[PDB]
Design an enzyme around this catalytic site. Structure first.
Site, PDB file in Angstrom:
ATOM      1  N   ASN C  13       2.427  -6.067   3.509  1.00 31.17           N
ATOM      2  CA  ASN C  13       2.197  -6.472   4.891  1.00 31.17           C
ATOM      3  C   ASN C  13       3.099  -7.649   5.245  1.00 31.17           C
ATOM      4  OD1 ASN C  13       1.045  -8.828   3.806  1.00 31.17           O
ATOM      5  ND2 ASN C  13      -1.046  -8.035   3.951  1.00 31.17           N
ATOM      6  N   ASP C 188      -4.792   4.549   3.180  1.00 30.50           N
ATOM      7  CA  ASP C 188      -4.723   3.094   3.224  1.00 30.50           C
ATOM      8  C   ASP C 188      -3.963   2.569   4.443  1.00 30.50           C
ATOM      9  OD1 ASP C 188      -5.222   0.549   1.488  1.00 30.50           O
ATOM     10  OD2 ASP C 188      -3.141   0.357   2.201  1.00 30.50           O
TER      11      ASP C 188
END
Ligand SMILES: CC(C)(COP(=O)(O)OP(=O)(O)OC[C@H]1O[C@@H](n2cnc3c(N)ncnc32)[C@H](O)[C@@H]1OP(=O)(O)O)[C@@H](O)C(=O)NCCC(=O)NCCS
Ligand SMILES: CC(C)(COP(=O)(O)OP(=O)(O)OC[C@H]1O[C@@H](n2cnc3c(N)ncnc32)[C@H](O)[C@@H]1OP(=O)(O)O)[C@@H](O)C(=O)NCCC(=O)NCCS
Ligand SMILES: CC(C)(COP(=O)(O)OP(=O)(O)OC[C@H]1O[C@@H](n2cnc3c(N)ncnc32)[C@H](O)[C@@H]1OP(=O)(O)O)[C@@H](O)C(=O)NCCC(=O)NCCS
EC number: 3.1.2.2
Lengths: 300, 299, 300
Positions: C13, C188
Site C-alpha cells: 500500500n 484481498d
C-alpha cells in the site's frame, strides 16, 4: 539464496521460449539480495549493493512456459569494494521430471551508502575453504579489472530499433535508483526486436557479452534504449544495445550514457533447431568497422 | 459495470498524479466487458467486443496516489452493429471522504465473431425508458458516423518513439490487442514528449476522438511515435501515431493502426497549470501542423 | 521447495505495508509447484495440482517494502486424492539483519488430469519419519473433511466495493484455469479497499478464514469480486468477499459462485500497530444477522 518461479506466458515469446531478459532479471534479483545482505553483515554504515558488472553468459538450453526456473546464487569472492557472485539457473520441467542447466552467470556488485548517495563502501571479507578459491577469485578479479582499462532489407537501418522508458517506482531500488535487472531486461527487449525485425522469424537470446554499469539512473529519468545490428555469422546475430538517460526534472543535468552491451541472438526452426540467418550487409565505413569488430568479439 | 481500484504509486508520475493512460486503460476494460457481455446476451454466435471509437475526453480533476478510482460504465445506445457505452470515472479520497468527477467518457464497441475472425455481427437492442434517449443516442450515433466520412523548444528536441512487441497479456483471448493497451502506450509516449519539452511535471488534460482502423495481432511489433504539433500559452498538443509490423509474415506489410492528438498540461509545484514554453515550428509541415493544431484546439 | 524475493512498492500500500494477497499469491505458487511435482513423481498420467483448500491463517508481523519475503513450503501429508502442504513465510530485513515470522499456512491441492479435464487422480504416498506425523496429518485430514459437510458513513453500503476482472493467460495455469493465488490476491484487493473506505486510514490483512475452492474458472471468464463489511470488534474488521464467474463466451452456461471467504483487517498507527476502528452499524435484517454471525465467527 534460491529460486522459485514458474514461467508464465508473459515470460516468453509467442512460441513460448522464455526471454533472455526474463532470466537476466531473476539472476540479478538473486545477486542483489545475497550481496546487500552480506554488505551489511559486519554492521557498518547502511548500504545497498548496486550491479556494476556482469560477465559473458551463454544460454545453454531453452526454457519454456510452465517450466520452473531455479536460481541459486553464491558469493565467490570479495575485494575491498566489490563482491563477486556466481549464479546457476536450472530449468525443471515438473510434468516430465526433466532438468537442464540453462545458465551459469557471474556478477559484480558494489555497496553504495543509503545516507550518502554515490559513496562507495568496503566489502567485508568472506570465509573460504581453500586458498585456490581466493586466488581463482583474485585472478578473475584482476582479469575483469584489467579489461576495464582495456531502408534496405538485411541492412542495419532496416532492423534498427529504439525504446523509451520512464523509470517508475517499482523499477527502482528502495532508493531513487534502477535495478540492474530492469535495465538488462529492457536491453533484451530491444535487441530481441532488432533480431526479430531482421530474421522475420522466432528468436532467442543465445548469449550476452560482459556489461559494465557506468552510472546510476534515478526515478523519473526517462531512459532510451537503442539497438542496432553489428555482425552476423551464418546462424547467429550480434546486436549492439546502447542505454542513455535523460533526467527531465533537472535543466542543469545533461543526458548520459548509462551502459552498453552486445547481445547475440538465434533464429529457431518451427521444429526447434537453430536455422541459418539472413546475412547483414554493412554499407558505411563505421558499419564494416563494427562488422569486423563483431567477427573479432565473436571469435573470443 | 462498477468499481474499485486504489491507485498505487506505479499508477502515477513522481509527483503522484495518476497517468492519463492508466485511467484510459481502466475505462476501456470496463467498456470491453459490459459490451462483450451484452453482445452475447441474446445468445447468437459467440463474439468479442472490439474497441472501434473513443470520443473526445477531458480530465477534469487530477487523481492522486492513494485515491480510489471508481469506474461505472453503462450502455447508452445500440445501432445494428455498434454499441455506445458511457463511462464515469470518479475519484474518492478515503482519508477526507471527498469525491470528484475525473472523467466522463464515451466509447464505441463492435462485436467480432470468435469463430470467424474479422466477421462483424449484430448488436441486440437495449431497453430504454424514454424515446429522447434513443434519439439523443441516434443523433450522437449519426454525429460520429458523419465525422468518419537539435534546438530546445523545437519539435525534434522533444520528439520521441517507443517500440513494443505485443505479448499475450496485451491481447484479447484472441490474437488481438486491447484498446486500453494501445491507449496506455500512446499516453506513455505523448507523456514523455510533453515532459521533454516542459522540463517539468505534466498530466493528460485531454484526448481527442480516436478511431481504431485495424486490428493488431500477437507478435506484431508496434511502434508508437509521438511529436509536438501546437502550443497554446498553457497547453501542449502532441500527435501520436501507432504503426504495426507483423515480423512473422514477409508478405503482410506495415500499416497505420491508429492515430490521435493528446493534450497535456504543466503543473505548479503548488498544483496549478502554468505557462508552457512555446513550440517554434521550422519546416513547411511543422507550421502546417501548428496551424491545424490551432484549428483543432478551437473546436 | 522454497525461495524468497524482494518486496517492491507494487507489493504494498502507499504506506508500504505489503498486501496480504501479495503473500497469499506467493504461498500458493510455492504450494502449487511442490505438489504438482510430487503428483508426477511416480510417473502416472500427467496432472496439475489445483488449489482446493486453504486453512485459516493469521498475519503475525507486518512486511514492508524492501524486505525479502522467504517462503518455505513442505509437504506434510497425503490422502488418496489430496496433498497437504504447510508453508512458512518469514520476512528478512537486509539492512538491519532482522527476521520475523510473518505467516504459517496450510494448503490442500488436488491433481487434475491434463488430458482429461475435471478428472481427479491419485496422490502417491510420502515417506514420514514417525507415525505421529501421519496421524496428526490424518486427524487434520479428517478435521477439514468433516467441516466440509458443514449512503451513510460507517454503514455497510458506504464501504461496499466490487471489482471485475477478465481472466488473462498469465492468470492461468498452463491449462485454461486460474491459479488459487490469482484469486486470493484479488479477494484481498477488494476486502482491502472495503476496509480502507471504512477506516479512512492505513490498513493491513490481519487474518483470513478457511477458503474452499468449489469450481474452476477458465481463461476468458470475467470474474466479479464483490466485498462488504459484516462485523466490527473494537479494533478489527470482518469483510465478506464473494467471487462470481461469468463465462461470457459459450454462454449456454450461467454465472456461478467460484468461492467465498471472510477477511479480517486492521487499522494502523503512523507509528504502526492497531488502533480502535469506527463501528459498523447494520440496518437491514440481513445486516444484523451477518453482524451477529460475525461476532460468532470472531469468537471461534
Ligand atoms: C559502481 C560505481 C558506484 C563505481 O563508482 P566509482 O565512482 O567509479 O568508484 P570506483 O570506480 O573507484 O569503484 C570502486 C570499486 O568499484 C568497482 N567497479 C567499478 N566499476 C566496475 C565494473 N564495471 N565492474 C566491476 N566492478 C567495478 C571497482 O572494482 C572498485 O572495487 P575495488 O576497489 O574493490 O577493486 C559506479 O560505476 C556506479 O554508480 N554504477 C551504477 C550502479 C547501478 O546503478 N547499477 C544499475 C545501473 S543500470
Ligand atoms: C470496428 C471494425 C470491426 C469495423 O469493421 P469494418 O470492416 O469497418 O465493418 P463495417 O464498416 O461494416 O462496420 C460495421 C459497424 O462498425 C461500426 N464502426 C466501424 N468503424 C467505427 C468507428 N471508428 N467508430 C465507431 N463505429 C465504427 C459502424 O458504425 C458499423 O455499425 P452500424 O452498421 O450499426 O452503423 C474494424 O474497424 C476493426 O476491426 N477495428 C479494430 C478493432 C480492434 O482491434 N480494436 C483494438 C485495437 S487497439
Ligand atoms: C478440487 C476439485 C477438483 C474437487 O472436485 P470433486 O468433484 O469434489 O472431486 P472429489 O470430491 O472426488 O475430490 C476428491 C478429493 O478432493 C479433495 N477435495 C475436494 N474439495 C476439497 C476441499 N474443498 N478441501 C480439501 N480437499 C478437497 C478431497 O480431499 C478428496 O480427497 P480424498 O478423496 O483423497 O479424500 C474441484 O472442487 C475443483 O476443481 N476446484 C477448483 C480447483 C481450482 O481451480 N482452484 C483454483 C480456483 S480459483
Amino acid at each position: 539464496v534460491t529460486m522459485g518461479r514458474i514461467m508464465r506466458p508473459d515470460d516468453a515469446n509467442v512460441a513460448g521460449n522464455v526471454h533472455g531478459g526474463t532470466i537476466l532479471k531473476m539472476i540479478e534479483e538473486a545477486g542483489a539480495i545475497i550481496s546487500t545482505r552480506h554488505c551489511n553483515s559486519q554492521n557498518g554504515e547502511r548500504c545497498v549493493a548496486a550491479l556494476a558488472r556482469v560477465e559473458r553468459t551463454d544460454f545453454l538450453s531453452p526454457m519454456c512456459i510452465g517450466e520452473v526456473a531455479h536460481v541459486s546464487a553464491e558469493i565467490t569472492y570479495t575485494s575491498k569494494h566489490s563482491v563477486e557472485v556466481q549464479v546457476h539457473v536450472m530449468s525443471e520441467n515438473i510434468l516430465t521430471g526433466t532438468k537442464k542447466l540453462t545458465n551459469k552467470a557471474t556478477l559484480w556488485y558494489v555497496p553504495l551508502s543509503l545516507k550518502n548517495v554515490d559513496k562507495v563502501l568496503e566489502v567485508p571479507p568472506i570465509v573460504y575453504l581453500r586458498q585456490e578459491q581466493e586466488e581463482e577469485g583474485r585472478k578473475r578479479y584482476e582479469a575483469q579489472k584489467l579489461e576495464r582499462m582495456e531502408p534496405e532489407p538485411n541492412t542495419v537501418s532496416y532492423s534498427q530499433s529504439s525504446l523509451i522508458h520512464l523509470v517508475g517506482p517499482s523499477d527502482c531500488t528502495l532508493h531513487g535508483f534502477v535495478h540492474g535487472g530492469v535495465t538488462m531486461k529492457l536491453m533484451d527487449e530491444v535487441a530481441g526486436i532488432v533480431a526479430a525485425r531482421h530474421c522475420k522469424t522466432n528468436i532467442v537470446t543465445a548469449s550476452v557479452d560482459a556489461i559494465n554499469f557506468h552510472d546510476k539512473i534515478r526515478k523519473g529519468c526517462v531512459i532510451t534504449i537503442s539497438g542496432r545490428m553489428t555482425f552476423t555469422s551464418n546462424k547467429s546475430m550480434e546486436i549492439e544495445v546502447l542505454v542513455d538517460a535523460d533526467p527531465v526534472v533537472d535543466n542543469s543535468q545533461k543526458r548520459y550514457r548509462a551502459a552498453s552491451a552486445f547481445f547475440t541472438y538465434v533464429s529457431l526452426n518451427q521444429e526447434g533447431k537453430p536455422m541459418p540467418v539472413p546475412q547483414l550487409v554493412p554499407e558505411t565505413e563505421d558499419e564494416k568497422k563494427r562488422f569486423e569488430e563483431g567477427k573479432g568479439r565473436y571469435l573470443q
